[model samples]
Target: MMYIQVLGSAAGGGFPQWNCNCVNCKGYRDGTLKATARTQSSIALSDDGVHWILCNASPDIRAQLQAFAPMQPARALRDTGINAIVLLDSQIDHTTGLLSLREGCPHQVWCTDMVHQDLTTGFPLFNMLSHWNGGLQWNRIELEGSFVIDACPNLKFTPFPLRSAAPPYSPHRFDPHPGDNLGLMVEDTRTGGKLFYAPGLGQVDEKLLAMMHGADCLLVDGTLWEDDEMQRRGVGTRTGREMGHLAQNGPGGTLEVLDGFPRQRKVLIHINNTNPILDENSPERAEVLRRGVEVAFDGMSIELLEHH
Candidate 1:
């Protein structure tokens, strides 16, 4: 009775990205990416027909919910149908969308301490992001560990360590921010299925790979086509991996790390708009499919019970 949803699929500024008005956004603006309407990164879980758990409220959470149902805060977070929340990081793209979610009086929040310090209140209307504001109970998360809340005994969490680099206007080349980037390990004890959900990965190591071995599904970051994709597009200056996410190609990409793992399902999440894979007909999209990995699309849901 557990299902996960792809709330938003595009990275950062979302597919087609912000500014520059790239082809993807152009297509998006002219109803191309919109025709697809697939979105950024967010996951929702249903323990019963009525109760639920939502993961990462993408910036588009409100709009995304509009496509489904009217999700209110007190009921969304404080009520039974959608009860709890687990935050992954403090990044604007990943956490800012939370403004749409804050009203539910979320019972609890699980995240890295770094995220708490990285953003004031960690919601869309953060002090700096006045447009998106909200709050919730905070649960500190550590790298590669397990914890449970509300007696969801079948679930556990393991965070991979992450280090931040200097953001756009920071004084240091790589600023050490307070948020802790994490990879979520959703374990269904009833069926013995494990799913590793990591939308933002700034660093990966052997220890984390060992963790990948046990997952029934692996959802890793797919933020850019190339490490320097952003720089080439006149955006940021560093590669994906350099900022804590691994590129999808070349010698040391995420796929290479997935090699020799015990993963049953490996899907990519938090994908970037610049990624050609967004285009259904793109060869790059086909390439990932051939690798036994698939991109998570908005409105897509996988019933874990079937996989088990």
Candidate 2:
């Protein structure tokens, strides 16, 4: 059996964004919505209870670790359950937690060459991480390459390029490469059950659809309800596509694409603060549930097992 944990499910600034007075944020603040606080988008996959591979290190890493005991230090000295981190991109919300992990330790990090270059040059996170105690071991995840985590024989993953852009801070933003972002096909090798994850989707082309077909579950991007949701709500002036995210609704949104896909467990992750789905009683949330999709929340656990 393989276990997947949704550590944080909100996008960027989190559900109750610190600076925003959006409806969802206000509702949470006023205790009007039955919503739990979310940090940022991140997850952990473990074949065994002792070892974990974190998907992305969200800015709320410290709190996220505290919420889950398995992720805590196992010894008084400095033992951690996290064995490696798979970075999908170099966005601040997804990568800032690396700084919090500078606790005099060494960690293995996996990402694509383009993302590595952007971080090593554009953001220089790896440079700073290398100055830590045990430092960091950078492993470039080549597209289409498959590998199993150390000691986790039942857990394996394949990296595939997705249509997306580099973080805005990246020096290569003007010339982003597909390798800067990717989707991971995480499979339980023992059972053949799989999870397809792409929290920062751009364009959902035939390739992406083909890759996710018949997946056991999907933790996909739900950054906005409509392409112009941010702008219309006075939060930002950028469309979802312009920000390298796929909206949850509209003619060409993720919902439309998944509407005809095979019957698979669908869960929306990396949700933006302005998304109406953040409100449990909102029509948007109802629509999502009505479509047989789930709104991912922190602490959501899923078990995938092979059935003979």
CA lDDT of each candidate? 0.64, 0.85
lDDT tens per residue, model 1, 1-308:
45676667667666655574655657767775533545667777654434456677677877776664423334433443456677776656566555655554534667766565555542313343333233466677765457775635455555555565433432333556544555677767667667777777756777777767767777788877678877766656767866677888777787676665534677787777667677777777888888888888877777667333
Off by over 4 Å in 1: 28-35, 69-80, 119-135, 142-144, 151-153, 164-179, 233-236, 259-263, 306-308
Task: Tell me the TM-score of each prediction against the true structure.
Answer: 0.80, 0.95
Clash pairs detected, candidate 2: none
What is candidate 2's lDDT per residue for 30-79, written digit by digit as tens? 98887778889999999987789999999999999889999875676777
What C-alpha lDDT does candidate 1 achieve relative to the native structure?
Answer: 0.64
TM-score of 2: 0.95
Q: Candidate 1 at 63: error in angstroms? A: 1.4
Stretch of 10 with least lDDT, candidate 2: 299-308
